Design an enzyme around this catalytic site. Structure first.
Site, mmCIF file in Angstrom:
data_model
loop_
_atom_site.group_PDB
_atom_site.id
_atom_site.type_symbol
_atom_site.label_atom_id
_atom_site.label_comp_id
_atom_site.label_asym_id
_atom_site.label_seq_id
_atom_site.Cartn_x
_atom_site.Cartn_y
_atom_site.Cartn_z
ATOM 1 N N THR A 17 48.938 61.038 -24.101
ATOM 2 C CA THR A 17 48.212 59.789 -23.815
ATOM 3 C C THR A 17 49.029 58.518 -24.126
ATOM 4 O O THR A 17 48.717 57.448 -23.609
ATOM 5 C CB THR A 17 46.831 59.788 -24.542
ATOM 6 O OG1 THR A 17 46.094 60.963 -24.154
ATOM 7 C CG2 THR A 17 46.021 58.551 -24.184
ATOM 8 N N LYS A 20 55.740 60.843 -23.584
ATOM 9 C CA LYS A 20 56.213 62.012 -22.855
ATOM 10 C C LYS A 20 57.184 62.827 -23.703
ATOM 11 O O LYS A 20 57.747 62.305 -24.681
ATOM 12 C CB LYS A 20 56.876 61.584 -21.544
ATOM 13 C CG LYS A 20 58.045 60.594 -21.688
ATOM 14 C CD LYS A 20 58.727 60.298 -20.331
ATOM 15 C CE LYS A 20 57.842 59.446 -19.386
ATOM 16 N NZ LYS A 20 58.441 59.288 -18.004
ATOM 17 N N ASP A 130 43.614 69.924 -35.505
ATOM 18 C CA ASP A 130 43.730 69.933 -34.046
ATOM 19 C C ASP A 130 44.293 71.264 -33.517
ATOM 20 O O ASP A 130 45.027 71.305 -32.544
ATOM 21 C CB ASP A 130 44.589 68.754 -33.604
ATOM 22 C CG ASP A 130 44.415 68.391 -32.141
ATOM 23 O OD1 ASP A 130 43.376 68.752 -31.495
ATOM 24 O OD2 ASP A 130 45.329 67.682 -31.637
ATOM 25 N N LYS A 132 44.338 74.136 -31.299
ATOM 26 C CA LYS A 132 43.953 74.390 -29.921
ATOM 27 C C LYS A 132 45.115 75.093 -29.206
ATOM 28 O O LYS A 132 46.230 75.033 -29.700
ATOM 29 C CB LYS A 132 43.597 73.081 -29.225
ATOM 30 C CG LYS A 132 44.667 72.009 -29.153
ATOM 31 C CD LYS A 132 44.056 70.779 -28.402
ATOM 32 C CE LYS A 132 45.040 69.659 -28.082
ATOM 33 N NZ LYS A 132 44.385 68.621 -27.164
ATOM 34 N N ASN A 135 48.553 73.259 -28.543
ATOM 35 C CA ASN A 135 49.419 72.881 -29.670
ATOM 36 C C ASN A 135 50.168 74.038 -30.312
ATOM 37 O O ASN A 135 50.842 73.857 -31.333
ATOM 38 C CB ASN A 135 48.564 72.240 -30.755
ATOM 39 C CG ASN A 135 48.176 70.839 -30.433
ATOM 40 O OD1 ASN A 135 48.777 70.214 -29.597
ATOM 41 N ND2 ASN A 135 47.156 70.344 -31.100
HETATM 42 CL CL1 LIG Z 1 53.393 62.050 -25.874
HETATM 43 C C1 LIG Z 1 53.266 63.778 -25.863
HETATM 44 C C2 LIG Z 1 52.451 64.418 -26.778
HETATM 45 C C3 LIG Z 1 52.343 65.791 -26.760
HETATM 46 C C4 LIG Z 1 53.056 66.546 -25.831
HETATM 47 C C5 LIG Z 1 52.921 68.069 -25.786
HETATM 48 C C6 LIG Z 1 54.243 68.756 -26.188
HETATM 49 C C7 LIG Z 1 55.225 69.134 -25.280
HETATM 50 C C8 LIG Z 1 56.384 69.763 -25.714
HETATM 51 C C9 LIG Z 1 56.583 70.018 -27.065
HETATM 52 C C10 LIG Z 1 57.782 70.701 -27.570
HETATM 53 C C11 LIG Z 1 58.257 70.690 -28.890
HETATM 54 N N1 LIG Z 1 59.360 71.481 -28.934
HETATM 55 N N2 LIG Z 1 59.617 72.023 -27.708
HETATM 56 C C12 LIG Z 1 58.649 71.556 -26.894
HETATM 57 C C13 LIG Z 1 55.608 69.636 -27.960
HETATM 58 C C14 LIG Z 1 54.460 69.013 -27.533
HETATM 59 C C15 LIG Z 1 51.796 68.452 -26.772
HETATM 60 C C16 LIG Z 1 51.328 69.882 -26.604
HETATM 61 N N3 LIG Z 1 50.742 69.925 -25.239
HETATM 62 C C17 LIG Z 1 51.849 69.804 -24.251
HETATM 63 C C18 LIG Z 1 52.451 68.416 -24.363
HETATM 64 C C19 LIG Z 1 53.843 65.896 -24.894
HETATM 65 C C20 LIG Z 1 53.957 64.521 -24.918
#
Ligand SMILES: Clc1ccc(C2(c3ccc(-c4cn[nH]c4)cc3)CCNCC2)cc1
Lengths: 317, 10
Positions: A17, A20, A130, A132, A135
Site C-alpha cells: 500500500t 514495492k 499479522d 497470514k 507473509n
Molecule cells: Cl511495500 C511492500 C510490502 C510488502 C510486500 C510483500 C513482500 C514481497 C517480497 C518479499 C521478500 C522478502 N524477501 N524476498 C522476498 C517480502 C514481502 C509482502 C508479502 N506479500 C507480498 C508482497 C511488497 C511490497
C-alpha cells in the site's frame, strides 16, 4: 555507507500500500536481495512513520532462521530502503492457491516452523499480529520465512497488552474485535487461521463485507472436513478457540502449550530450529534471477529528520 | 482462489 547505485534492479516481486519490493543484485559482490522501497512523503502523509521504524528496529534486533533477515537498511533524501534476504520460493499463498490443500504432514512441517518463529519473537517480547499466508515466504531450501514486521508490538512480556486495532480483517481474532485490550495470544489465533487454510483449503470464516466478516469471527463456530484427523481437528479448535484464555497457546506457557499438542507429537522441537529435517518441498528454481514463485502480475511489469533516526542498518553477517 | 488480503491499522 549504502546508496541506491550499489544495486542492479532486476524485477518486481510485489507491491503493497506504501511501496514495492524488487529483486536486486549488490553491484560489488554479485549477491541477490529482495529490496523493499517506500516513499518518505507517502509514509509521512499517512502517519506510517511509527510502523516503518518499528519494522526496522525489529529487524535490527531479531535473528532466527524462519524470519527474514535484514542486510542493509538505508535512506535517500526521498525514500526508505530495506535490503532483505531474498526468499526464492515466494509466498505460501502462491503455493496453497496452486495446490488447493496441503497434506497434514506438510502442514505440520510449516506449522512447527511458524511456532518456532513465534516462540522466538515472543521471547524477544514482540507480538507479530499479522500472521497470514501472504507473509509466510519460502527460502531456496523450502523453510518458512516470516516477512513484514510493521504491525509488531515491542516490549510485551508475559501477560502485557496492546490496544491498537490492526491486522488483517480476515485473520483478526475475536478479542481484537471487542473494545479495549488484548494479549500475545492473538498470534495463536493467526497460526490457527493458516493451519486451517493449509489443511482445509479455505479460510475458516469469510465474507467480502467486513461487517459480516467480523460477525462470523465473533459468533460463528468453525466447521471441519469429516476426514480431517482427530488430532488436526483438535489443534484447529484449540488454536481457533474464541476466548484467548481458553485458546491453545493462551495460557502462561504460551508456545509450550501448542508445541505439546498431540498434532505435533512427531516433531522434535530442537530439530526444527536447527533445520535437521528434510523439507516437504524444495523451490525448483533454475537461477538466482528465477521468479517462478511470484505472480506474473508483478514479475511482468517494468522498472522505473530525527523522525527516521533508528532506520539505518548494516548487518554484521 | 481466495483474493489477496490487506493489512490495516487504525
Ligand atoms: Cl511495500 C511492500 C510490502 C510488502 C510486500 C510483500 C513482500 C514481497 C517480497 C518479499 C521478500 C522478502 N524477501 N524476498 C522476498 C517480502 C514481502 C509482502 C508479502 N506479500 C507480498 C508482497 C511488497 C511490497
Amino acid at each position: 555507507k549504502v546508496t541506491m547505485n550499489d544495486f542492479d534492479y532486476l524485477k518486481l516481486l510485489g507491491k503493497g500500500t506504501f511501496g514495492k519490493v524488487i529483486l536486486v543484485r549488490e553491484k560489488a559482490t554479485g549477491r541477490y536481495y529482495a529490496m523493499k522501497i517506500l516513499r518518505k512523503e507517502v509514509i509521512i502523509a499517512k502517519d506510517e512513520v511509527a510502523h516503518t521504524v518499528t519494522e526496522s528496529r525489529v529487524l535490527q534486533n531479531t535473528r532466527h532462521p524462519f524470519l527474514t533477515a535484514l542486510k542493509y537498511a538505508f535512506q535517500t533524501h526521498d525514500r526508505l530502503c530495506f535490503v532483505m534476504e531474498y526468499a526464492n520460493g515466494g509466498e505460501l499463498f502462491f503455493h496453497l492457491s496452486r495446490e488447493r490443500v496441503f497434506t497434514e504432514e506438510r502442514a505440520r512441517f510449516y506449522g512447527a516452523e511458524i511456532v518456532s518463529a513465534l516462540e522466538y519473537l515472543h521471547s524477544r517480547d514482540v507480538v507479530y499480529r499479522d500472521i497470514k499466508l501472504e507473509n509466510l515466504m519460502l527460502d531456496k531450501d523450502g523453510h518458512i520465512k516470516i516477512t513484514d514486521f510493521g504491525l509488531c508490538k515491542e516490549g510485551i512480556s508475559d501477560g502485557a497488552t496492546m490496544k491498537t486495532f490492526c491486522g488483517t480483517p480476515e485473520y483478526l481474532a475475536p478479542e481484537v474485535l471487542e473494545d479495549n485490550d488484548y494479549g500475545r495470544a492473538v498470534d495463536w489465533w493467526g497460526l490457527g487461521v493458516v493451519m486451517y487454510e493449509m489443511m482445509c483449503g479455505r479460510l475458516p470464516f469469510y465474507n467480502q463485507d467486513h461487517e459480516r466478516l467480523f460477525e462470523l469471527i465473533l459468533m460463528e463456530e468453525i466447521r471441519f472436513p469429516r476426514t480431517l484427523s482427530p488430532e488436526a481437528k483438535s489443534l484447529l479448535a484449540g488454536l481457533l478457540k474464541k476466548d484467548p484464555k481458553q485458546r491453545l497457546g493462551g495460557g502462561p506457557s504460551d508456545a509450550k502449550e501448542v508445541m505439546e499438542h498431540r498434532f505435533f507429537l512427531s516433531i522434535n522441537w530442537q530439530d526444527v530450529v536447527q533445520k535437521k529435517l528434510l523439507p516437504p518441498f524444495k523451490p525448483q528454481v533454475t537461477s538466482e534471477v528465477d521468479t517462478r514463485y511470484f505472480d506474473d502480475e508483478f514479475t511482468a511489469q517494468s522498472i522505473t529528520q530525527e523522525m527516521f533516526e533508528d532506520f539505518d542498518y548494516i548487518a554484521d553477517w | 482462489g481466495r483474493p489477496r488480503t490487506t493489512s490495516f491499522a487504525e
